[PDB]
Structure formats: C-alpha cells, structure tokens
C-alpha cells in the first residue's frame, strides 16, 4: 500500500526571491545563471546539489550589485530562492 | 545591469 505525492521530487531554483526583480547584465549574462554555471563547474564533482545552490545563493548575494545611471535601479541587490520538494540527496557524480 |  505505497504511494508518493504527485508534487514530490521537484526542485525549483528561482533566480530571485518571490516578488522581486531578477538582474541580467547586458554583456556577461544574468547574475543567477553565471553563478550557477561557475558553481557547478567548481563543485558538481564534490557537493550535493542543494549545497551547490547554497553557494550560488552566496555568490549572487555578495558579488553582484546593480549599476545604473537611473537612480531607481542603482546599487540594488538580489537573493535567489531554492524551492525544494526533493525527497533524497542529489549528486551529479 | 537591466531588470528582467
């Protein structure tokens, strides 16, 4: 007599907190996707996924600050949002 | 830097 829920085993890696802008840079790419790719390149041979995404959080949170001539969009930060309905640990190796 |  065994079922799992139909929404289990989904992971949502959103680029930004619910309600907020997500920042993209014109030449280097969106802040989130650069960090996600840098972090996987560094650690997907070393670290469970959720810990890779926690490092993507820290990177985006600390190494980016919007720059703009428009005062309303200048010196703005961003924090991505891990939404995990996963039931086990995920390793890419 | 541009809002998405």
């Amino acid at each position: 007599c065994h079922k799992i829920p139909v929404e289990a085993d989904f992971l949502y890696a959103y680029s930004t907190a619910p309600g907020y802008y997500s920042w993209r840079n014109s030449k280097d790419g969106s802040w989130f996707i650069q960090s996600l790719c840098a972090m996987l390149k560094q650690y997907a041979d070393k670290l469970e996924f959720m810990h890779i995404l926690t490092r993507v959080n820290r990177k985006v949170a600390t190494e980016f600050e919007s720059f703009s001539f428009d005062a309303t969009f200048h010196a703005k930060k961003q924090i991505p949002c891990i939404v995990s309905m996963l039931t086990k640990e995920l390793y890419f190796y | 830097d541009v809002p998405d």
């Binding site: 989904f10 992971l11 014109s26 969009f73 | -």
Partner: protein, 139 residues
C-alpha cells in the same frame, strides 16, 4: 540517502531561451541571455546531459514543447532538467507574446502525469522576474 543517478543517461536538459518579444508586449529584448544559454549548454554537456536549446517561442509553443517532452520515454534517464530564460512575474514565465503559468508547464511532469519520471528528480531553473520590488541591501 541519495537518488539513483547511474541510469545509462543522466537525462534531458531543455533550455528555452526567449530573447526577442512580440509587439503586443513592448518588453525590452533581453540582451545577454544568449551568453546565458551558451553557458548553460556546456555546463550541462559536462554533467553528461542531453541538451536541447529552443529559442524565441510563443507561450503556445512552450506548453506544446513541454507536453511533448513529458510524453517521452524517460525510463532510461536518471533525471530531467528544464531551464527557462525570459521575462516573468510571480508564478509566470513569458512566451514571446504573453504569459504562461509555471504550474501549467510543471504539471506535465507530476508523478501521476509522467510515469517514466516518477521517483526521479525534476529540476526547474528559472531566470525571470517575480515582481518589481527592489532589494536595497544593508551593512
């Protein structure tokens, strides 16, 4: 413990890349997202994933693409990755012409609705706005 990831293939990576939008939108074309997609494709070839870049899809084309992929035979794939690059707002991803519920896209992979992926991890990486609040920071 941990998911089983030595099926023969790691799985599919579906990259939808929406840079240029229709008239009825008036949204800026999202410059630099091509750097993003090219970056994603090679990262995931290194993770031994089957990548498929699709570019500049209407919101109808998206739901179709996902319905199709959700009816494939995933039995020999460990996992399924999906990347959406586009404008957005809370709960919403933008096709080239208008918005889609993210739950419409994701519902095609519900365990009851996609048997070959039940019990296997499904990853949705979403680069999109979720609103229009700004984070100003502190310290």
């Amino acid at each position: 413990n941990s998911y089983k990831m030595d099926y023969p293939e790691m799985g599919l990576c579906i990259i939808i890349n929406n840079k240029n939008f229709h008239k009825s939108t008036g949204m800026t074309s999202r410059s630099g997202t091509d750097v993003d997609a090219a970056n994603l494709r090679e990262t995931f070839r290194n993770l031994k994933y089957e990548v498929r870049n699709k570019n500049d899809l209407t919101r109808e084309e998206i739901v179709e693409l996902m319905r199709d992929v959700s009816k494939e035979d995933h039995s020999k794939r460990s996992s399924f990755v999906c990347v959406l690059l586009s404008h957005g707002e809370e709960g919403i991803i933008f096709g080239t012409n208008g918005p889609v519920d993210l739950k419409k896209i994701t519902n095609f992979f519900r365990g009851d609705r996609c048997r070959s992926l039940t019990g296997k991890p499904k990853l949705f990486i979403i680069q999109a706005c979720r609103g229009t609040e700004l984070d100003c920071g502190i310290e």
